[PDB]
């Protein structure tokens, strides 16, 4: 790979520079290079990996949604025929998005998840796996199998997190938030989504008297997003 000649520590240093410069494509490339050195990632390094690809795919998702919206209106009654360009360009963005998801999933499978034994790394990577199958599901039309893959990854992450992490652990909370969104937006299970978000919120509240000052802002933010969703859903 193009990063094969760069020191691991240099890749990490440049990923942090790319983050400061909001150069997320570069950041992802540097972190892919770091993963491919074959050593496990630290907590800080996992965060760099996730933020890089989250921002890359986030921009692709936002663009895909803009184009898909334009495409669907072009297929409403009364809409003037305009040729294949909207579909073509939506497909172009879609294919690029799928390629990024496939790249992330390949890294997780080679071999981050295999070597992750600690709960904090294993749940983190399985959550990522669920997240990127979910992003694939958003554009899939095939779709059932992708949805099943997302659910299986989220479920294994959930089982570990509940056995090995306190309720206010930010990774546990962020997994529950995203799995509840999966239920609501992807899997047509709004009641499961609401139940998961509420149980997660309530149990985190009762655990707050143990939560570290370190993690307070992360976990409070995610708790507020759980609350925001519940307000939106109920």
């Amino acid at each position: 790979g193009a990063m094969g000649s760069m020191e691991r520590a240099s890749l990490i240093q440049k990923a942090k520079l790319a983050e400061q410069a909001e150069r997320y494509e570069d950041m992802a490339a540097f972190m892919k290079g770091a993963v491919e050195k074959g050593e496990e990632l630290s907590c800080e390094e996992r965060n760099l990996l996730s933020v890089a690809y989250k921002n890359v795919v986030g921009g692709q998702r936002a663009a895909w949604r803009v184009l898909s919206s334009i495409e669907q209106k072009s297929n409403e009654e009364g809409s003037e025929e305009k040729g294949p360009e909207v579909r073509e360009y939506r497909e172009k963005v879609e294919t690029e998005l799928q390629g990024v998801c496939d790249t992330v999933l390949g890294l997780l499978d080679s071999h981050l998840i295999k070597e992750a034994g600690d709960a904090e790394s294993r749940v983190f990577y399985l959550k990522m796996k669920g997240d990127y199958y979910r992003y694939l599901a958003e554009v899939a039309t095939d779709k059932k199998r992708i949805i099943d893959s997302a659910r299986s990854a989220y479920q294994e992450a959930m089982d570990i997190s509940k056995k090995e992490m306190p309720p206010t652990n930010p990774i546990r909370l962020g997994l529950a938030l995203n799995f509840s969104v999966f239920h609501y937006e992807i899997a047509n299970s709004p009641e499961e989504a609401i139940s998961l978000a509420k149980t997660t919120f309530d149990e985190a509240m009762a655990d707050l008297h143990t939560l570290s000052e370190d993690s307070y802002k992360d976990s409070t933010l995610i708790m507020q997003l759980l609350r925001d969703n519940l307000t939106l859903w109920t």
Partner: peptide, 5 residues
């Protein structure tokens, strides 16, 4: 519905 932004 929101995930972390």
């Amino acid at each position: 519905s929101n995930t972390l932004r």
